Amino acid sequence: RREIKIEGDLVLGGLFPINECGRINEDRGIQRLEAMLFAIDEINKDDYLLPGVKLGVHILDTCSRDTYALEQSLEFVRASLTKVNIPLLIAGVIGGSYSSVSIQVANLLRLFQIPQISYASTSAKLSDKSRYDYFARTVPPDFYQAKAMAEILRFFNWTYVSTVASEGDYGETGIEAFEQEARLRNICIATAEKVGRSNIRKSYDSVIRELLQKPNARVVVLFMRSDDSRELIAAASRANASFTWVASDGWGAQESIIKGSEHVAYGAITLELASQPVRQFDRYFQSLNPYNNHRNPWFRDFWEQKFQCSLRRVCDKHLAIDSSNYEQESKIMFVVNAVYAMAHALHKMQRTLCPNTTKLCDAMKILDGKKLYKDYLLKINFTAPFNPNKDADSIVKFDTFGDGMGRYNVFNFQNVGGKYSYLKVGHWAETLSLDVNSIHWSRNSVPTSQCSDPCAPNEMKNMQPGDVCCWICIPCEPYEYLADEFTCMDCGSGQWPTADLTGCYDLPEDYIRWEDAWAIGPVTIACLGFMCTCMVVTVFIKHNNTPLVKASGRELCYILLFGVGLSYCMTFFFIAKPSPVICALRRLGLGSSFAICYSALLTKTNKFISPSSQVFICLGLILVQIVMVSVWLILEAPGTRRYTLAEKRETVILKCNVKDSSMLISLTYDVILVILCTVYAFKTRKCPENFNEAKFIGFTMYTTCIIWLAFLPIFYVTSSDYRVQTTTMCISVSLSGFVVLGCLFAPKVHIILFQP
Amino acid sequence: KVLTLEGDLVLGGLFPVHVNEHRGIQRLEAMLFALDRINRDPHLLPGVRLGAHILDSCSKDTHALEQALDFVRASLPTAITGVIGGSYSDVSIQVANLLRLFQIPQISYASTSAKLSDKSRYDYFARTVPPDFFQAKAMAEILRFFNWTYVSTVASEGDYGETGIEAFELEARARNICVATSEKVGRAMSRAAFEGVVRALLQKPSARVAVLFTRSEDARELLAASQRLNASFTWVASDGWGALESVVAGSEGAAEGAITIELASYPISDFASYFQSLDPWNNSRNPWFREFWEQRFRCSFRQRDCAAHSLRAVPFEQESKIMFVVNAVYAMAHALHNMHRALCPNTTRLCDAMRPVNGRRLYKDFVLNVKFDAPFRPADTHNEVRFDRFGDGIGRYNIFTYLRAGSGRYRYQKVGYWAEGLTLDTSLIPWASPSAGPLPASRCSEPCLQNEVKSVQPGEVCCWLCIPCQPYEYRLDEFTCADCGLGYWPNASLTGCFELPQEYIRWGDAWAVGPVTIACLGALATLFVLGVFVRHNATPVVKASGRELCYILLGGVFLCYCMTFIFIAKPSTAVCTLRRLGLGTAFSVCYSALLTKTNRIARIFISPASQVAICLALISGQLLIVVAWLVVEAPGTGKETAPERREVVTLRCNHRDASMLGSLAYNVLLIALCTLYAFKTRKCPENFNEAKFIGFTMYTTCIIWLAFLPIFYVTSSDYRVQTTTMCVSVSLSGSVVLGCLFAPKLHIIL
Ligand SMILES: CC(C)CCC[C@@H](C)[C@H]1CC[C@H]2[C@@H]3CC=C4C[C@@H](O)CC[C@]4(C)[C@H]3CC[C@]12C
Ligand SMILES: CC(C)CCC[C@@H](C)[C@H]1CC[C@H]2[C@@H]3CC=C4C[C@@H](O)CC[C@]4(C)[C@H]3CC[C@]12C
Ligand SMILES: CC(C)CCC[C@@H](C)[C@H]1CC[C@H]2[C@@H]3CC=C4C[C@@H](O)CC[C@]4(C)[C@H]3CC[C@]12C
Ligand SMILES: CC(C)CCC[C@@H](C)[C@H]1CC[C@H]2[C@@H]3CC=C4C[C@@H](O)CC[C@]4(C)[C@H]3CC[C@]12C
Ligand SMILES: CC(C)CCC[C@@H](C)[C@H]1CC[C@H]2[C@@H]3CC=C4C[C@@H](O)CC[C@]4(C)[C@H]3CC[C@]12C
Ligand SMILES: CC(C)CCC[C@@H](C)[C@H]1CC[C@H]2[C@@H]3CC=C4C[C@@H](O)CC[C@]4(C)[C@H]3CC[C@]12C
Ligand SMILES: CC(C)CCC[C@@H](C)[C@H]1CC[C@H]2[C@@H]3CC=C4C[C@@H](O)CC[C@]4(C)[C@H]3CC[C@]12C
Ligand SMILES: N[C@@H](CCC(=O)O)C(=O)O
Ligand SMILES: N[C@@H](CCC(=O)O)C(=O)O
């Protein structure tokens, strides 16, 4: 048990990590330990701060272990019992550097009402004034640093990063805080390792191997204590790591962690608290030798370790700590400020409470913890002891919970000129102030987030593979819509995708549209068919002018003219828009006109009142058969005008959508009766008065059978594909209405014979 | 001073000896007796013997810290596997805070405070006595089982009351129990303020039960105030008024039937014999027994005036908590035995692996998962000692319902117990079956028949009005009157919104039996009569009116006659379309039939082949208007044909209702042509019987026009009997014209 036992009227304890625990820390333990001694003597040699009383110390060691800290911390509360190495009363102690050390000591000291303040315990678990009530700080908590790292990553467009932490209370506490900050800035962590302080071969190699097996993430964040950073860096050299490490205040600007393995830490970003170096402490440390520093038991080991010799065998014993081999620790001003916290607080508490004399009055024999800490420490405001500035940064003030203020810096490992040294790159007062001067690993800032890249709305298939938070883009949606991130839904078969891709709107179908391309072809025949009706009307106009008695066509010719007159008109409906009224009339018009014309010819071929009634009866029998099937077909007219030709939504088109095969089936028996009556004529061997007309009937009907037997296969092969294939169907129907006019021309030429 | 018992695994104690008699000495002797009995008892640590390290607490936090520092100064004395203490909440909290850092678990026996139930701050702390907030679950269970929902919660200013009330409020949400009002009872704020606060609790006559998480004095003074006000209440009180006759004192009040939750205890018989046998000579281990003997018996050992007095005279009674100390010490012993049987299996003695305390694994694994049998059992087979995952014990509560029927007053009678199950003996409660209810606190607007329901909750959560919508407004979700079918009452299905397709088609006679039979009879007679003239086809033609007029007349009468019969049909999508087509063609042809005949007479004052051409041309023009109107109108079935407050009665075509006005307009053109045709006739001499029929037809059109006005107003919104009757009149008038047209043929043939 080696410790400093400087006595005095009032004793201020301390806890420093001198041992890293055979080895001795050179920059974190000894440098901070000498700062407290330097501040203590200045307080004694002062006139405007607590005069007449000398301050002693009870500094101990922690070995960077929380369990060992508790055993040493028990010495502080020894003098607070008074029930039974004489103990000394301690007004307050200085907290340990590590967060884990501070937590264990703070919990123990809370019960005995012993105030404690730290200089480097930047942990977010503390500062909750419900458990660690008697604990103030000079440094900001561990949640501004998480924001600083998130801002740095977002500034360099870094998204895919990996994070590691230590099993100590400092490790996992800040990782959780970093999680929300990463999620807010649209970035994610690859993996969240939790490595312990056990060894290197068991765990450190596995952690590096996991990062090495996936070279996709080139930049990682090192949120670990300084104790665990030394061995990981050495382990990285063995595995030949080439990462760009982003370190917290743990690594900081230390030049002892990277010793012999600096070839892997190239271009590493480290965050360290801003602190102006103190010039007075430089003279004290540079003129420090073992021959005049018998107060420090650990100085002999530090001298034997920093300057390799024995007090290389025995050294010349003349060399001194000079600027050539000595650098100022960043967290030295905090230690000096920490010592002055009690020095100023006790001055505000001793003189004010006992204005009669500037000494230890009888009221100060027993110290208090509630009044000393809550009232005085939380409001103490005083300028920096040894600093050339008087701005807001120089003055130290405790917050509501007891803290400092965010002054995180952005260091960089920026080897230049053959010398390995850190160099300042930015500042994080409240805004990003990084300047682009860092010398990165190879030739520029390493790029990351190659697992996910900005895609285009054309694909919209942001599916997630087995890993997490990095989607890869693949084309999907063959004219579909994507209303979700990773799904390509199939839209309606009769619709077309929108420009915004969030929906599938109904494309405008194309009808015959009258004046158009070859689809307008049957319209020309329909117009020609209208002229045929006018010619038929002209024949009818000449028919009533003294009709021939021997013709016997008093009304059968008119019915035939009526049959062929609407045959041309039915072609107009078939080439018109697919209206519900037209779709119903298309089937009825074609069947009625064909049956009526065929029936009239059959009746004429086979007094005169009975054939007219028979012609109407047979035509009516077919007509009532049409409406018999119409009620099962036209009843879907409200549901008609629906899109069809749904072949992978390849430009679907709208049509009647009902009675497609039924209309073809309907025409089957319409012509079956016609052809049955055609063959029953048997050439109609009769008198020559009507034999020539019968020969015309025997020729027109014979041609009608041939064209009908050939038209039906044309209808089947042209099914679907409207406006390109239905045009042939419309052309055939118009041709079907045109040819029957040619059949009606046989009576016309017979009437022409009568004319002259 | 320090009490040390020779052993191997020394155990710690923190009883508040300072000299306190009924709380300090009793439990100390309890654990000493338990340790002595278990040292000689087999089946638990046969080789290794437990020790004792008893340090007083003085009921102070600083003294507790100073004494407990001894338990951590060793193995930072023999390494202590654990300490037993926690008589006071503050002492237990301080000791748990001190001992959590050194990984030395403890078991408590009397720390019932709810502040120690969180493992975030006290990770290595456990207790045997249940905390004070487990009574809340029993409260809600007994309240729900007794049909009580409206409660008047009463709290206390202390931490106990606040924790109990917050636990009860949190746990009552799952029990469907709402707090009518929440109040506070301070540490005796004022005598006159208690009347005000009890009035604030009793402001609602609906609520009759009141939770009473208050201490003994507060409950007693509140009961006194209630008795002064002379109010009637049932109080489901807490451990503060737990089977205590001092709290009720002599003020009976309304304490009858007040359910009380009281902690249970074991009547240990072995400990009584041991405790009655202590003397200040043989029991030299105790360093405070001399002071206790001096204080209790009022004598000094120096004066030699203490031997006469002895404990054999004064009766001995346990303070309802000696069981907990024995349970805690035996839980520690069983945990140590489980260590021995799982860490030193080869050797029955203490192996080298048990030299460390191993407190971290011990408490987490084999302390919270112990199920040892009940020790010193009075044969009540209760046991059930098992610390939960929150490091807290469980126990049973003996319900003590207040009663005064047997002893007159102050008779606490046990009813049941709460041990992982609610057990109430209703037959023992004074509110037996022959009573006007067990003072039902009940709820607010809760009992409803579900036929009427609003469920808006104007006030409290339990309060919800059940008022039905006036038309019942197709209520589906029992919360908002929906509009699935319409704004009136539907068939309601299986208690939900619906849309009944029910409607009247007027098929079974109804109020139109006459017109239905008249139309069919007239149609058959007219068709048969018309065929008589066609039989000859030679006699009428020589008297003019050839087959062209005969065919038109025959077609006209057939169309109008059949149009009357088609009216009686189901108004489907086809019927609405043909409804316009019915009179759009039948009335057109008959009007055009007489127009052609009238035009021929006017033109003669001929073109027989073209005589029918002009007649059908006018008919086709009327059909052209009909086809052009029906496509725009698009006739369809109309669901809305009933008034706002009536059910669906008629499903008449809504489109045809507007087309009905146009139907008269369509018939107006036919009527206008008929009037113009009649004027063109002028004189009608010789065979002109149709002129009289034309005049009758003009009256018929006027009658139809006269009957057309009520169709828009009332004749369409009615049961359609009048609408169907109008078709018969039009058909009959057309048949009357036919009777006045083929009147010559009726007489010439005869
Ligand atoms: C507008 C259209 C659709 C109405 C229905 C068709 C009409 C115009 C047709 C169908 C049957 C036809 C009749 C059939 C037979 C004869 C007998 C003849 O000696 C004179 C013409 C006459 C009387 C025809 C007139 C026109 C007629 C009535
Ligand atoms: C002249 C002979 C041969 C045929 C009789 C003419 C027929 C086919 C014509 C004459 C007037 C035409 C109508 C004129 C206007 C419209 C409105 C339009 O939105 C749908 C088609 C529709 C309803 C037409 C249907 C066909 C129609 C009724
Ligand atoms: C008298 C002889 C020449 C017969 C004349 C028939 C005329 C009037 C008929 C025959 C086919 C008819 C067309 C058939 C279909 C349509 C499409 C519809 O959306 C508007 C009306 C329109 C464009 C019709 C107008 C009238 C029409 C051209
Ligand atoms: C005239 C325009 C508006 C429509 C023409 C449609 C054609 C295809 C149809 C529709 C209704 C049909 C008429 C309906 C009823 C009859 C009565 C029957 O005893 C002879 C045929 C006849 C006269 C039909 C002839 C063909 C017809 C006129
Ligand atoms: C709108 C429709 C219903 C009007 C009527 C159309 C049909 C049924 C009509 C129009 C012309 C009529 C024909 C006209 C003339 C004659 C000659 C007569 O000696 C017998 C009846 C007969 C043969 C008729 C039969 C019915 C007939 C064919
Ligand atoms: C004017 C009269 C004398 C002769 C002509 C009658 C014609 C127009 C009638 C007779 C039967 C009728 C059909 C009967 C049933 C249906 C089914 C319905 O879902 C749509 C209308 C439809 C398809 C009707 C259309 C019109 C129709 C074809
Ligand atoms: C007899 C001739 C001259 C004229 C009448 C022709 C008939 C067959 C035509 C003309 C107008 C047509 C109607 C026009 C519109 C509709 C609405 C649709 O949702 C169902 C079919 C329906 C109801 C049609 C049925 C057939 C119809 C009634
Ligand atoms: N400040 C770091 C460690 C400081 C140091 O290593 O000096 C922590 O959170 O413990
Ligand atoms: N249960 C009380 C005291 C227990 C007792 O007095 O027995 C507490 O919170 O400490």
- Please indicate if any CB of chain B lies within 8 Å of the CB of A627: no
One-letter amino acid of B363? Y
What's the sign of the alpha-carbon dihedral B212, B215, B216, B217?
negative
User: What residues does ligand 1 touch, defined as CB less than 6 Å away?
Assistant: A 554-555, 558; B 609, 612, 616, 620
Q: How far apart are CA B430 and CA B441, in angstroms?
A: 17
Q: How far apart are CA A749 and CA A752, in angstroms?
A: 5
Residue A331 labelled as part of a binding site: yes
Q: How far apart are CA A731 and CA A712, in angstroms?
A: 13
Q: How far apart are CA B600 and CA B546, in angstroms?
A: 12
Q: Where are the alpha helices (DSSP H) in B604-688?
A: 608-633, 654-681
Q: What is the CATH number of the domain that holds A722?
A: 1.20.1070.10
Length of chain B (residues): 750
The CATH topology of domain B132-263 is Rossmann fold (3.40.50)
B313, two tokens: 């005279």
In a domain, residue A631? The reply is yes
User: What residues does ligand 2 touch, defined as CB less than 6 Å away?
Assistant: A 565-566, 569, 581; B 627-628, 631
Q: How far apart are CA B425 and CA B427, in angstroms?
A: 6
Closest CA to B633 of B600, B661, B611: B661
Q: How far apart are CA A230 and CA A235, in angstroms?
A: 9
A279, two tokens: 């010039």
- CB of A722 within 8 A of CB of A516? no
How far is residue B34 CA from its own chain's centroid?
Answer: 52
What's the sign of the alpha-carbon dihedral A291, A292, A296, A298?
negative
Closest CA to A588 of A560, A533, A626: A626
Rg (CA), chain A: 52
**How close B211 comes to chain A (CA, Å)?**
31
Q: How far apart are CA A516 and CA A131, in angstroms?
A: 87
Q: What is the CATH number of the domain that holds A164?
A: 3.40.50.2300
What's the sign of the alpha-carbon dihedral A465, A471, A473, A475?
positive
Q: How far apart are CA B578 and CA B555, in angstroms?
A: 18
Q: How far apart are CA B202 and CA B152, in angstroms?
A: 8
- How far is the CA of A164 from the CAs of A248, A410, A450, B611, in angstroms? 11, 19, 21, 107
Q: How far apart are CA A3 and CA A59, in angstroms?
A: 6
Q: How many domains does chain A have?
A: 3
B359, two tokens: 């407190």
- How far is the CA of A576 from the CAs of A479, A515, A654, B627, in angstroms? 30, 11, 13, 18
Domain final position from A428, A454, A487? A428
CB atoms B573 and A108 under 8 Å: no
Q: How far apart are CA B446 and CA B448, in angstroms?
A: 6
- What SS3 class is residue B151? strand
Closest CA to A25 of A96, A88, A85, A104: A96
Q: What are phi and psi of A336, to 5 degrees?
A: -65, -40
Q: How far apart are CA B441 and CA A559, in angstroms?
A: 94
B374, two tokens: 């009940």
Q: Where are the alpha helices (DSSP H) in A354-421?
A: 370-371
Same domain membership, residue A605 and residue A697: yes
| CB neighbour list of residue B549: distance below 8 Å, 6 or more residues apart | B593, B596, B597, B611
Q: Count the Cβ atoms, other than its own, within 10 Å of residue B407.
A: 10
Q: Is A634 in the pocket of ligand 7 (CB under 6 A)?
A: yes
Q: How far apart are CA A161 and CA A452, in angstroms?
A: 12
End-to-end CA distance of chain A: 148
What's the sign of the alpha-carbon dihedral A481, A484, A486, A491?
negative
| CB neighbour list of residue A590: distance below 8 Å, 6 or more residues apart | A570, A574, A663, A667, A733
- CB of A441 within 8 A of CB of A244? yes
What's the sign of the alpha-carbon dihedral A647, A649, A650, A652?
positive
One-letter amino acid of B246? S
Listing DSSP states for B734-749 in one string gives HHHHHHHHSHHHHHH-
- What SS3 class is residue B664? helix
Q: How far apart are CA A723 and CA A510, in angstroms?
A: 7
| CB neighbour list of residue B405: distance below 8 Å, 6 or more residues apart | B411, B430
Listing DSSP states for A220-255 in one string gives EEE---HHHHHHHHHHHHHHT---EEEE-TTTTT-S
- How far is the CA of B156 from the CAs of B164, B197, B236, B258, in angstroms? 9, 12, 15, 19
Q: How far apart are CA A159 and CA A188, in angstroms?
A: 6
Q: How far apart are CA B59 and CA B65, in angstroms?
A: 11
One-letter amino acid of B265? S
Closest residue (by CA) to atom 23 of ligand 1?
A: B612
Same domain membership, residue A316 and residue A257: no
- Please indicate if any CB of chain A lies within 8 Å of the CB of B609: yes
Same domain membership, residue A659 and residue A552: yes
One-letter amino acid of A413? F
- Please indicate if any CB of chain A lies within 8 Å of the CB of B108: no
Q: What are phi and psi of A681, to 5 degrees?
A: -65, -40
Closest CA to A256 of A420, A122, A131, A442: A420
Q: How far apart are CA A411 and CA A152, in angstroms?
A: 12
Among A111, A537, A607, A635, the strongest candidate for a mutation testing the B interface, having the largest count of B CBs within 10 A, is A111
Listing DSSP states for B28-55 in one string gives HHHHHHHHHHHHH-SSS-SS--B-EEE-
Q: Where are the alpha helices (DSSP H) in B125-183?
A: 135-145, 159-172
- CB of B554 within 8 A of CB of B534? yes
- How far is the CA of A563 from the CAs of A291, A539, A590, in angstroms? 135, 15, 10
Locate tokens 């065979």: which residue?
B687
- Please tell me which residue of chain B has the smallest CA distance to A544: B609
Beginning with the edge strand found earlier in the chain, give each strand of the sheet holding B150-154 in spatial order: B178-183, B150-154, B209-212, B234-237
- Please tell me which residue of chain B has the smallest CA distance to A105: B101
Ligand 4 binding pocket mutation candidate from A566, A593, A670 (most atoms within 8 A of CB): A566
What resolution (Å)?
3.7
- CB of A189 within 8 A of CB of A182? yes
Q: How far apart are CA A288 and CA A295, in angstroms?
A: 12
Same domain membership, residue A526 and residue A423: no
In a domain, residue A593? The reply is yes
How far is residue A492 CA from its own chain's centroid?
Answer: 28
- How far is the CA of B681 from the CAs of A584, B553, B594, B601, B670, in angstroms? 43, 18, 11, 6, 17
| CB neighbour list of residue B537: distance below 8 Å, 6 or more residues apart | B547
Q: How far apart are CA A493 and CA B603, in angstroms?
A: 65
- CB of B674 within 8 A of CB of B594? yes
Closest CA to A317 of A291, A350, A280, A285: A291
A580: alpha, beta or left, given left = phi > 0 and alpha = psi -120 to 50? alpha
Name the residue facing A74 among B76, B97, B609 (closest C-beta).
B76
In a domain, residue A389? The reply is no
Same domain membership, residue A163 and residue A131: no
Same domain membership, residue A307 and residue A217: no
Ligand 3 binding pocket mutation candidate from A569, A570, A577 (most atoms within 8 A of CB): A569
Q: How far apart are CA A529 and CA A632, in angstroms?
A: 32
B49, two tokens: 């013997």
Q: At what angle do helices B216-229 and B191-201 cross, to 10 degrees?
A: 70
Q: Count the Cβ atoms, other than its own, within 10 Å of residue A348.
A: 17
Q: What are phi and psi of A63, to 5 degrees?
A: 55, 25
Q: How far apart are CA B58 and CA B186, in angstroms?
A: 28
Ligand nearest to the CA of A559: 1
Same domain membership, residue A600 and residue A684: yes
Residue spans of beta strands (DSSP E) within A471-594 = 496-497, 504-505
Q: At what angle do helices B513-536 and B721-741 cross, to 10 degrees?
A: 20
Q: Is B546 in the pocket of ligand 5 (CB under 6 A)?
A: no
- How far is the CA of B556 from the CAs of A623, B563, B586, B594, in angstroms? 21, 11, 7, 10
B66, two tokens: 């100073």
Q: How far apart are CA A529 and CA A735, in angstroms?
A: 9
Q: How far apart are CA B420 and CA A131, in angstroms?
A: 35
Q: Give the determination technique.
A: cryo-EM
For A43, which DSSP code?
H
Q: How far apart are CA B500 and CA A106, in angstroms?
A: 76
| DSSP H or E run through A584 | helix A580-605
Q: Where are the alpha helices (DSSP H) in B146-284?
A: 159-172, 191-201, 216-229, 245-248, 270-275
- CB of B359 within 8 A of CB of B103? yes
Range of the domain at A350: 10-140+277-379
Q: Where are the alpha helices (DSSP H) in B393-488?
A: none
Q: How far apart are CA B749 and CA A269, in angstroms?
A: 126
- Taking the centre of ligand 7 as the mean of its atom positions, its distance from the CA of residue A581, in whole angstroms, is 6
Task: Indicate the pairing of strand A653-655 with strand B12-14.
Answer: unpaired
Q: How far apart are CA B612 and CA A117, in angstroms?
A: 120
How far is residue A40 CA from its own chain's centroid?
Answer: 55
B293, two tokens: 């003997």
Residue spans of beta strands (DSSP E) within B547-600 = none
Q: How far apart are CA B598 and CA B677, in angstroms?
A: 6
Number of helices (H) and strands (E), helices first, in chain B?
20, 13
Cα angle for residues B492, B497, B499 (degrees, 5° grid) = 80
| DSSP H or E run through A686 | none
Locate tokens 């016309």: which residue?
A748
Listing DSSP states for A111-148 in one string gives HHT--EEESS---SSS--TTTS-SEEESS--TTHHHHH
Q: How far apart are CA B515 and CA B327, in angstroms?
A: 99
Residue B182 burial (10 A CB sphere; 0-12, 13-18, 19+):
middle
Domain final position from A399, A428, A457? A428
Q: How far apart are CA A321 and CA A343, in angstroms?
A: 29
Closest residue (by CA) to atom 7 of ligand 9?
A: B110
Task: Indicate the pairing of strand A188-192 with strand B261-263.
Answer: unpaired
Q: How far apart are CA B710 and CA B677, in angstroms?
A: 28
Q: Is A569 in the pocket of ligand 4 (CB under 6 A)?
A: no
Same domain membership, residue A660 and residue A622: yes
Q: How far apart are CA B24 and CA B14, in angstroms?
A: 9
CA-CA-CA-CA torsion for A543, A548, A554, A557, nearest 10 degrees?
Answer: -50
Q: How far apart are CA A190 and CA B23, in angstroms?
A: 60
One-letter amino acid of B47? G
Same domain membership, residue A244 and residue A126: no
Q: How far apart are CA B232 and CA B443, in angstroms?
A: 18
Q: How far apart are CA A750 and CA A756, in angstroms?
A: 10
How far is residue B444 CA from its own chain's centroid?
Answer: 14
Rg (CA), chain B: 52
- Please indicate if any CB of chain B lies within 8 Å of the CB of A581: yes
Same domain membership, residue A595 and residue A742: yes
**How close A101 comes to chain B (CA, Å)?**
12
In a domain, residue A422? The reply is yes
How far is residue A158 CA from its own chain's centroid?
Answer: 14
Q: How far apart are CA A18 and CA A37, in angstroms?
A: 14
In a domain, residue A470? The reply is no
- Taking the centre of ligand 8 as the mean of its atom positions, its distance from the CA of residue A302, in whole angstroms, is 20
Same domain membership, residue A659 and residue A595: yes
- How far is the CA of B394 from the CAs of A408, B424, B710, in angstroms? 52, 19, 85
- CB of A33 within 8 A of CB of A113? no
For B61, which DSSP code?
H
| CB neighbour list of residue B390: distance below 8 Å, 6 or more residues apart | B117, B119
Number of helices (H) and strands (E), helices first, in chain A?
18, 16
Query: What own/partner pairs with CB < 8 Å and gap ≥ 24 does B199-202 have?
Result: B199/B229, B201/B152, B201/B154, B202/B152, B202/B229, B202/B231, B202/B233
Closest CA to B157 of B217, B199, B200, B201: B217
Same domain membership, residue A710 and residue A623: yes
Task: Indicate the pairing of strand B209-212 with strand B234-237.
Answer: parallel
Ligand nearest to the CA of B129: 9
| DSSP H or E run through A427 | strand A422-428
- How far is the CA of B414 from the CAs of A607, B115, B379, in angstroms? 119, 30, 18
